[PDB]
A paper describes a structure:
The genome of [name] contains genes that encode a suite of proteins that are biochemically capable of performing the various concerted steps needed to completely depolymerize and transport all classes of N-glycans found on host glycoconjugates. Here we characterize SpGH92 (TIGR4 locus tag SP_2145) as an α-mannosidase that trims the terminal α-(1,2)-linked mannose residues on high-mannose glycans to generate a substrate for EndoD. We also identify a solute binding protein (SBP; [name]) from an ABC transporter (ABCNG) that binds soluble N-glycans and, through X-ray crystallography, reveal the molecular basis of its interaction with these branched glycans. The identification of an ABC transporter that possesses an SBP, [name], that is specific to the recognition of N-glycan fragments suggests that this is likely the convergence point of the complex and high mannose N-glycan processing sides of the N-glycan degradation pathway, with this transporter functioning to import soluble N-glycan fragments into the bacterium.
[name] also bound to [name]; however, the low affinity and limited quantities of the sugar precluded binding analysis by ITC. Instead, we employed a UV difference binding analysis by taking advantage of a perturbation in the UV absorbance of the protein upon sugar binding. Used in a quantitative fashion we obtained an affinity constant of 1.2 (± 0.1) ×104 M−1 for [name], and thus approximately two orders of magnitude lower than what was obtained for Man5GlcNAc. Despite these two complexes being obtained with different ligands and in different spacegroups, the overall conformations of [name] were very similar (rmsd of 1.0 Å over 427 matched Cα positions); both complexes were in a “closed” conformation relative to the “open” conformation obtained in the absence of ligand. An overlay of the structures in complex with the two ligands showed that, within positional error of the structures, the location of [name] is the same as the corresponding [name] portion of Man5GlcNAc. The reducing end of the carbohydrate is oriented into the base of the protein binding cleft and fully sequestered from bulk solvent with no room for additional residues present at the reducing end, consistent with our proposal that [name] specifically binds the products of EndoD hydrolysis (i.e. having only the single non-reducing GlcNAc residue). Only four direct hydrogen bonds are made between these two monosaccharide residues, though a notably extensive network of water-mediated hydrogen bonds is present. The recognition of this disaccharide motif is completed by the indole ring Trp386, which sits over the glycosidic bond and oriented parallel to the co-planar arrangement of the Man and GlcNAc pyranose rings such that the aromatic ring of Trp386 packs against the α-face of GlcNAc and the β-face of Man.
Numbering used by the authors: 40 to 94, 97 to 489
The structure:
Amino acid sequence: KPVIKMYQIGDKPDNLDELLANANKIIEEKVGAKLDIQYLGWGDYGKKMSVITSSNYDIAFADNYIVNAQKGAYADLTELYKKEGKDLYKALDPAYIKGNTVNGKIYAVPVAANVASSQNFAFNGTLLAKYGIDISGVTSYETLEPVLKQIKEKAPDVVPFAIGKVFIPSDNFDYPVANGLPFVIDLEGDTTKVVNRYEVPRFKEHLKTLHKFYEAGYIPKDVATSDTSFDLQQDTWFVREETVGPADYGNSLLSRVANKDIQIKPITNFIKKNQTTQVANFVISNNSKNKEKSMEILNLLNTNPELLNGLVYGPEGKNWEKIEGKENRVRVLDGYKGNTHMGGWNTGNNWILYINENVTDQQIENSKKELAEAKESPALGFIFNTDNVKSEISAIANTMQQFDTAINTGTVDPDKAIPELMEKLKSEGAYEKVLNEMQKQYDEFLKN
Ligand SMILES: CC(=O)N[C@@H]1[C@@H](O)[C@H](O[C@@H]2O[C@H](CO)[C@@H](O)[C@H](O)[C@@H]2O)[C@@H](CO)O[C@H]1O
Ligand SMILES: [Br-]
């Protein structure tokens, strides 16, 4: 009975022992293995894993998937999916296959959740109710400014907009590769061309908007170095940006974890793309000596309702109880409020998850409506080939790192800093080389 070492992003729940104890009860019974989760934290998960990958594990939360897949850091899963992961493979929307297949080979166990999703303003309804601030005209950042002014007056001690050092203005863009290049596909523009986000006149606008937010104090002054969370349960923040999807049932899940009414406002379109498919992938180590077992566990994580909810909702009777009368329905208790559970988006199949009392019958109907009506990005399945430009990438992803954080967070004036970035980029030659190559492959992708 071997021990399976799984690396996970984020902070560990306080009841982790209890969480694995009841989990292993089922896992051992059906697999004969013992899962061990080591959380690695948030802020520097990218670097902390890079050490492990460079320097032995079994399962891991995938950091920069597409890149580390072409290098051979991830084990092949095509044959495992034909046996130990046959069940979970059947429950997967084909778009997950489109997005996580590199060189006719898949290395990921994508968590079946929001395969399509939009970026949203999540509002604190406790602060919305108390001051009656009108969020009816908010369709962008530009329209979010007036609403930030009000909360700054009525509640000076609350952070209006709560963002961090990872913040980039969200738009209707498509990243064939990022991290960490400024190359997008403008889904509101020429869908055939690959462009620079800083040359898109409306994204430059978001930057102006966010610099005004900085100057006005709607944004934490130390935002360029701030990597801190704002627990949704706490009224430290007024509004934040979130990825919201069908497996969340609108603001049902948001209002649940926050233990208060959370209102949401779309700022991007609802679409199926690589980014949405690769948002939460699980991989198995190249050097993993329990590969066949690792898939047998990622299977149980995505196919067993009891096992999954025992981690996502937490212990039964403490954090939740079942609703007698209606099947597949539960209600969270007092035990749920706090670090006593995991997140569903990065643990397993969001569909075998029980549904909480606060989800309306219209919220389930809308999760069926959004699902079926979900449109696909023309670049979905477009995995960029880096064989020719592996080092021309790191030249650009270096010039960016020297400037992008201060810019994307609005700390500096885009009118002065954006030309600095461009000139240093265009002076190189790796810019035009990767730009052309990217356009060249994308042409062949739409040519077919
Ligand atoms: C509230 C909740 O559980 N929401 C999840 C989203 O977080 C998730 O989006 C991701 O969120 C993480 C951390 O905030 C971030 O690192 C990712 O870039 C991504 O934005 C979403 C994914 O479909 O699923 C929701 O349920
Ligand atoms: Br534009």
